[PDB]
């Protein structure tokens, strides 16, 4: 029930910049006294969160330079003065309020980059996988930015059945780009039910739509 709106919901930014995050609520935020209060923390590659604010203004001991924020009760907001590569992850705030208490949804933080198209690939299903009776093919999109590309498929030139699923890399460790896999799935007989298999793309780093294909019996 206790409101916690955390925003921007996601963020991408360049190194050395200022950036800020806002937490908004329904009430004042204590277990008692009139006087216990909110805290903020960073979660990454499956480690627990790392505490950053302990109590509104209160910086956690031994942590970074100032992520510190301001506001009270219904309002609070962090600001960091400088983007470090260290900082990418999930940020969220917690209230210092009487429990039961609830996290707000979390705020994503990333590096910003120049827009850049993927290299794009598709291929026939391997014939062992074909005669496995259930079959799949993959549209692959290596090393591109941002991960806001969008991907399509056509079979005998007409859009896919929806028997398809997708996955993206993490933000690249250094290039801070991404890659995408889209997979389309068939029975061997659905794989007969069309001949040419295609995947098609539009993206920020695309000047114009891109198309790739294979045709079976080759």
């Amino acid at each position: 029930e206790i409101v916690m709106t955390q925003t921007p919901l996601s963020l991408s930014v360049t190194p050395g910049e200022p950036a800020s995050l806002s937490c908004r609520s329904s009430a004042s935020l204590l277990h008692g006294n009139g006087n216990t209060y909110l805290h903020w923390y960073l979660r990454k590659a499956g480690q627990s969160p790392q505490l950053l604010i302990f109590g509104g203004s209160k910086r956690v001991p031994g942590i970074s330079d100032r992520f510190i924020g301001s506001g009270a009760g219904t309002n609070f907001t962090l600001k960091i003065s400088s983007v470090e590569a260290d900082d990418v992850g999930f940020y969220y705030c917690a209230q210092g309020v009487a429990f039961p208490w609830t996290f707000g949804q979390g705020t994503k933080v990333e590096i910003k980059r120049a827009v850049a198209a993927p290299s794009v690939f598709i291929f026939p299903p391997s014939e062992d996988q074909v005669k496995s009776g259930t079959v799949s093919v993959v549209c692959l999109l290596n090393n591109f930015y941002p991960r806001e590309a969008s991907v399509k498929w056509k079979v005998d030139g007409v859009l896919k059945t929806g028997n398809s699923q997708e996955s993206v890399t993490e933000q690249d460790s250094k290039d801070n780009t991404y890659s995408l896999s889209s997979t389309l799935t068939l029975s061997n007989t659905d794989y007969q039910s069309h001949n040419v298999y295609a995947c098609e793309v539009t993206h920020q780093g695309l000047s114009s739509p891109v198309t790739k294909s294979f045709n079976r019996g080759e």
């Binding site: 627990s48 109590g55 391997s126 996955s167």
Partner: protein, 219 residues
């Protein structure tokens, strides 16, 4: 500072009752509260419960009050958390928290949280194939190696190329649930067309509990 100990994962049938357990650091251990937080996939974190082992007591989320039970072994302060009637929806990572005698007026640091996962599934070694598989012809410059993991359970898997002798340009897509509750994964390596038209390449894949290796040579 010094961390609680909390061990590795388990995988389960629906409706069961299932547990995680956690242990004190270089630390006194009846003296301060414990909290349990659920990290749910794709979604914001979730407080379940406060606990104090000294008396064997708690304060509890109204989302539950039914399926949970919690305490610790007072011989070690080995915390236990018990959940029951587990849904696939409970598939999550569970984090064992201390509380810090001042900083708990906000919060405190944890040990290493642990995964548990719920499904009617059962073990399978992956089906495995080439992908790319080679450029039959293109604007030769680079292309990529690629290999498939499919029909697999449970995740995760371990993977490498030319037994991990190759490392540059290698990538690994995060896992996808097949509608059967099985997994697919894939790996790819962008490589010069000159190199690709020359050297032999293999995708080298391993896991337990499948206890299974595959070393799929590719063209």
């Amino acid at each position: 500072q010094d961390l609680l100990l909390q061990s590795g994962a388990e995988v389960r049938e629906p409706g069961a009752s299932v547990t995680v357990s956690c242990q004190a650091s270089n630390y006194t251990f009846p003296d301060y509260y414990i909290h349990w937080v659920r990290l749910v996939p794709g979604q914001g974190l979730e407080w379940l419960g406060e606990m104090k082992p000294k008396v064997g007591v708690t304060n509890v989320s109204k989302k539950i009050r039914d399926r949970l039970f919690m305490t610790a072994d007072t011989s070690t302060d080995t915390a236990y958390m018990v959940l029951s009637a587990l849904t696939p929806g409970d598939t999550a990572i569970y984090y064992c928290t201390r509380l810090e005698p001042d900083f708990l007026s906000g919060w405190a640091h944890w040990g290493k949280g642990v995964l548990v996962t719920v499904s009617p599934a059962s073990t399978k070694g992956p089906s495995v194939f080439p992908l790319a598989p080679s450029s039959r012809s293109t604007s030769e410059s680079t292309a990529a190696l690629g290999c498939l993991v499919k029909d697999y359970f449970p995740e995760p898997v371990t993977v490498s190329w030319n037994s991990g002798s190759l490392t540059s340009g290698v990538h690994t897509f995060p896992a996808v649930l097949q509608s059967s509750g099985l997994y697919s994964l894939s790996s790819v390596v962008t490589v010069p067309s000159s190199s690709l038209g020359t050297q032999t390449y293999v995708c080298n894949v391993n896991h337990k509990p499948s206890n299974t290796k595959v070393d799929k040579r590719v063209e």
